[PDB]
Design an enzyme around this catalytic site. Structure first.
Site, PDB file in Angstrom:
ATOM      1  CG  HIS A 146      41.202  46.556  43.148  1.00  0.00           C
ATOM      2  ND1 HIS A 146      40.684  47.712  42.565  1.00  0.00           N
ATOM      3  CD2 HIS A 146      40.514  45.489  42.676  1.00  0.00           C
ATOM      4  CE1 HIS A 146      39.757  47.301  41.716  1.00  0.00           C
ATOM      5  NE2 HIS A 146      39.616  45.973  41.753  1.00  0.00           N
ATOM      6  CG  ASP A 192      41.975  50.797  42.232  1.00  0.00           C
ATOM      7  OD1 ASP A 192      43.029  50.152  42.228  1.00  0.00           O
ATOM      8  OD2 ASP A 192      40.885  50.305  42.567  1.00  0.00           O
ATOM      9  CB  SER A 225      38.909  45.336  38.519  1.00  0.00           C
ATOM     10  OG  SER A 225      37.885  45.509  39.487  1.00  0.00           O
TER      11      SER A 225
END
Ligand SMILES: O=C(Nc1ccccc1)Nc1cccnc1
Ligand SMILES: O=C(Nc1ccccc1)Nc1cccnc1
Ligand SMILES: [Cl-]
Ligand SMILES: [Cl-]
Ligand SMILES: [Cl-]
Lengths: 695, 697
Positions: B64, B206, B632
């Site tokens: 992402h 991810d 992240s």
């Protein structure tokens, strides 16, 4: 893993003892004496119950006693919402059409039935499964005046293992069974439909009744002279609770299982029964929910119809999950291949021939069974105007004496029941347009009910126009249209009525399909008798239980949770803290009773809380249960009552075909929570005092 | 509580970290005067964290985080977003425009310097102590004359911490040639998609792979075909030892924002205004939108992204309000401030109690304005699409009122109309959303506080919201294409000045700006009072168990690999497996499609050295580390500093952790490095990436 006959306790006893059973065999079940079995009842024909006092007090589920609680509820005394607690025996409410059945004696009558059957002649006779034929044999064995010589007693013979074993039951039935206590619906049905088939569960699903009888403890219908029954056996209540891995057992009346399905019957159950029910109910429920969410008045009128449709929809989803992920088809295929290889070795080809007959019958009836489920799910239960009034022969032979008014009054009564306070013609038209669009793309023109052929022939494929026309022109399309008919009624108007023609046509097709499918049941039943006989001869009547048939069975296991999916564990026990977590005052299903909320806040748990001070609510066990087991007593290793079975998780509904050790659990209300609700919510101390509560 | 620590605080936390399982030497993790593991951590593209995993500048981050770069290189012929991307040679790695990676070369405490410069006070109420412009002037003064020219690639920045009580200067090295090297297909990279956002258990792989490029000397250089991979100071070793329950785990990264020093009154405001309004308004908007999407498959295509974008912060607000209601966040802030007030009374210094009082008074005074701001922002600015319809500029109106500049003004208005009424815009869906949103807005905001045009609902339309909305579209120039074209053929300023949609949009934006301008002055007294408040907290309990709020600067956090109980009788373990991916597979649901190569690996059990001791293939794990947005892609380390995973999310139960860490619920959601390597190896077949990494047994 199984639902064992009482006769099989002897053969299972050593395994039960190794799993933790501490009680003597004959204290649990004695074929010629008093045992714990004598405290178990079939409650109102479809539930299990249990006697818990020397004055005939009976515990069962709240959902089992629901109709009785509702029948005694008024706007002034709403027992369904507020609960009910009779503070004296004289205050307990009688119930019309209620019964409790005790299983007084059970006898193996296999040799007797098989000898009587030898006089049939026609080898294809179905008398071996006929309730009428078996009742004639039961009456012959019991005697020409058994119920007169033994009042309250009756006999019944049932087939087991597909006609390979027969048992005669001597039953004692009591019909004066009075309502004693019930928690409010907020407790008795806490999860309501949202938590149905769900574990973790926080529902206090119990209700209390009392068996009444004459002065000698003999069955008697309701009379103000009736006295509470002093039973020969009742359950002691344990306050020791449960811990993970504890031995647990249940006695009750499981209704049906399909443990001996062939692989082809599993495929049929998935691809026809379940897939059609899932597809059709998802369409019906989707339109219905859209309408209920847009209009609060539609939500009131359709909530019960929506919930009734959802219950078996969820069951079918759970069953198809097991077929897809637990290899039910493969395990039945391995079961039948092993029997076929054993029969080939012994030189007996009748078992392979029997499996073949079942496969061929399943394959031959496929299109008909698909058409039956499509019309039943799609129209018979899917569309409300399918159950609109159809004029009888007596009503048409009256409209064309001056009893034309009598015929109209009977038609009007049925119209008023169809178009009742909960019926919306607009909601029904929307549901019918979606249901018929699906039905018309799945059923070809040549297989359609005659009136549905008009969609292509008269309405150019426009389903909406066809449905609009049924309501616009029908005498049952609105009140004004019925009244105009009732003022000038003619049989020619009813004979050409679009709604009458639709309803008649779809019911005609439903009956024609049922009649065409009925003959296919018999070759499967006869082949199953040979198939199960082979399975029993090969692997023995020891690790393969007979299918459930609403007869008394026992099951044993342990108090144990399970992992529903990767990295998720559901423990063996829920607490009152879980009830409070779920509280939502603006959601009728998750409202918490104020008295119960106060008990939780003050920690007024008395002798009912666990060692850590947390209040238990429910637990789950690896016992094998099904529909009919609601209200079943759950016992300790010592035979003391530790809970009541009230549900099973959706992951284990495939257990009716194949038990699922890692997923299937019985959902049980902890007896400590039952006592806490009777005590702190109901304040009915007399019920606690009459029970035998052990430390 | 269990903080986001400054690199400077490693020394004073080291002994506690060692007692919790840390085995590496302090200076191998962070050394202010030499190379350490800190030199392998990057700020990836301004809002994510990344990590260097090879001596040739290979970088791992989330899928992402690299999503825009994967998408920008995807075409109908080579759909990398859908199928994945695996460059089989360094020359095949794709350059990316507008990308950057920032290394934190040096960090220096400049508190005494900044505080001495601040003493040259012209106004005691000056906000220069938090001004990026003022602090940059101080950073440039300290670094020297033309620092950027004398040290190419390096830049200096001073940030305030602890509400202006501590200042750090960061020397940053930025690289802008960062090439796409590898990415799994979206079916792995975003497996749960929106359904599993903020959810644990999680089964999402991810990750994405980039490579830092630089000139011949390893110095930053913009994209050039002459650029060579960067040989870095430090890179992470990859561990194949996996994780077990209770194992020590640590993260380094760039958490963006926290509100650890909120008063109890600020927690009440966050709940009763910010969160309750966002929840109520988005539930109305989302409900109408979902009903329209479910009834028309074309509406579902046009509105899926708008619906998902609205749901993300809606879910966060639900999770945050659950913590305020059940974890005593308000009570714990009240106890924190009462303890400081009692201590201040004994020290003979009332300024801490005066500071808390100023914050409470400011919060109480701005309540009606803040409620009106959130109501219009959530209800109309975000809630109604025709609020962002074209408003003719002052120059566009002047152009329409004798030259060819009229045709230019119409082309500019047309361009904006075409962007508003694009292929995803439905006027029918928008009218339905506006009727429900305005009905709630009109119920909450009284007539005297309404944007001028909304007064017409009562005055002209007799309270009929539907009629008011219908009239806006029926009479507006932007109500349909035919209505715009009729205007564009014969345009007049007078038509635009009386246009109902122009008047609505202008009116609601005027009110939104008036409210913003009235609310802005309330921020400063709270900020100044927070400087005194946090100074007291630090003087009283020390800068040891209270971390400075996150501010997009490098921090470390430590904890253990551990699951949690979300509710009664339910336990979520510490690790997910490839089994869980297969359980969730739904081929007719784009979010839960399983890559055929991955499904085959699972069936054949082709897990190599990446499977755990029991032969199960790990996917993700969770830890008690304290992370937030900005974390992240953060490297997750072992007790030995080896890479064991990448942080990619946090469970909704722990979103309240930005105000108060929740030990029994808050977890960082991490993709297991064994699963990352399994995907590179068995799905991508990109052996060269495994070979260039230092994989330890
Ligand atoms: O009828 C039911 N619920 C209901 C009743 C009235 C109003 C709203 C909901 N539940 C149900 C039905 C069939 C099997 N199990 C549960
Ligand atoms: O836009 C999103 N999903 C989406 C995109 C296109 C179509 C369907 C869905 N997700 C998202 C996730 C996190 C924050 N904001 C938005
Ligand atoms: Cl009895
Ligand atoms: Cl002071
Ligand atoms: Cl917590």
């Amino acid at each position: 893993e199984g639902m064992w006959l009482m006769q099989q306790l002897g053969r299972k006893y050593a395994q039960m003892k190794e799993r933790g059973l501490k009680m003597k065999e004959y204290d649990l079940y004695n074929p010629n004496g008093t045992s714990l079995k004598d405290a178990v009842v079939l409650f109102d024909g479809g539930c299990t119950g249990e006697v818990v006092s020397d004055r005939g007090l009976v515990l069962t589920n709240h959902h089992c006693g629901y109709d009785m609680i509702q029948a005694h509820s008024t706007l002034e005394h709403n027992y369904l919402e507020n609960g009910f607690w009779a503070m004296r025996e004289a205050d307990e409410l009688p119930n019309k059409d209620i019964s409790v059945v005790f299983i007084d004696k059970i006898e193996d009558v296999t040799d007797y039935v098989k000898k009587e059957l030898k006089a049939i002649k026609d080898p294809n006779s179905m008398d071996y499964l006929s309730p009428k034929y078996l009742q004639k044999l039961a009456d012959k064995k019991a005697g020409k005046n058994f119920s007169a010589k033994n009042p309250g007693l009756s006999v019944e013979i049932k087939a087991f293992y597909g006609g390979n074993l027969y048992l005669m039951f001597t039953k004692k039935t009591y019909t004066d069974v009075r309502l004693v206590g019930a928690p409010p619906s907020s407790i008795g049905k806490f999860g309501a439909d949202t938590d149905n088939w769900i574990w973790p569960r926080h529902t206090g699903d119990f209700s209390i009744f009392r068996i009444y009888a004459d002065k000698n403890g003999n069955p008697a219908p309701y009379s103000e002279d009736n006295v509470p029954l002093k039973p020969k056996r009742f359950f002691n209540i344990s306050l020791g609770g449960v811990q993970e891995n504890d031995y647990a057992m249940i006695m009750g009346f499981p209704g049906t299982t399909h443990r001996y399905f062939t692989a082809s019957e599993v495929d049929e159950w998935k691809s026809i029964d379940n897939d059609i029910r899932i597809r059709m109910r998802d369409i019906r429920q989707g339109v219905m929910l859209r309408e209920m969410l847009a209009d609060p008045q539609i939500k009131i009128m359709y909530s019960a119809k929506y919930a009734a449709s959802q219950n078996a929809y969820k069951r079918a989803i759970g069953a198809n999950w097991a077929i897809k992920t637990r290899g039910l088809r493969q395990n039945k295929q391995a079961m039948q291949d092993r029997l076929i290889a054993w029969g080939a070795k012994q030189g007996t080809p009748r078992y392979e021939e029997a499996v073949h007959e079942i496969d061929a019958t399943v394959a031959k009836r496929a299109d008909l069974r698909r058409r039956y489920w499509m019309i039943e799910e799609g129209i018979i239960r899917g569309i409300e105007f399918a159950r609109s009034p159809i004029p009888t022969e007596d009503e048409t032979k009256a409209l064309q004496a001056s009893a034309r008014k009598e015929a109209i009054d009977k038609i009007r009564t049925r119209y008023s029941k169809f178009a009742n306070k909960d019926y919306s013609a607009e909601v029904d038209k929307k549901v019918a347009v979606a249901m018929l669009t699906e039905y018309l793309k799945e059923i070809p023109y040549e297989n359609l009910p005659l009136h549905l052929r008009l969609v292509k022939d008269r309405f150019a494929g426009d389903v909406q126009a066809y449905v609009d026309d049924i309501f616009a022109r029908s005498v049952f399309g609105s009140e004004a249209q019925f009244d105009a008919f009732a003022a000038v009624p003619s049989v020619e108007k009813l004979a050409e009525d679009p709604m009458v023609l639709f309803a008649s046509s779809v019911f005609d097709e439903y009956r024609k399909l049922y009649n065409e499918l009925r003959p296919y049941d018999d070759p499967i039943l006869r082949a199953q008798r040979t198939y199960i006989a082979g399975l029993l001869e090969m692997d023995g009547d020891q690790d393969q239980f007979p299918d459930a048939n609403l007869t008394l069975r026992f099951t044993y296991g342990q108090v144990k949770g399970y992992s529903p999916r990767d990295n998720v564990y559901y423990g063996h026990q829920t607490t009152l803290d879980g009830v409070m977590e779920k509280e939502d005052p603006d959601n009728w299903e998750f409202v918490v009773d104020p008295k119960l909320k106060a008990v939780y806040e003050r920690k007024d748990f008395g002798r009912y809380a666990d060692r850590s001070g947390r209040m238990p609510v429910a637990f789950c066990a690896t016992t094998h249960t099904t529909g009919g087991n609601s209200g079943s007593p759950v016992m300790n290793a010592n035979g003391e009552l530790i809970g009541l079975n009230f549900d099973r998780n959706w992951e284990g509904v495939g257990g009716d075909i194949q038990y699922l050790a890692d997923y299937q659990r019985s959902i049980i209300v902890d007896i400590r929570y039952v006592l806490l609700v009777i005590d702190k919510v109901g304040g009915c101390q007399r019920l606690l005092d009459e029970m035998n509560i052990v430390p």
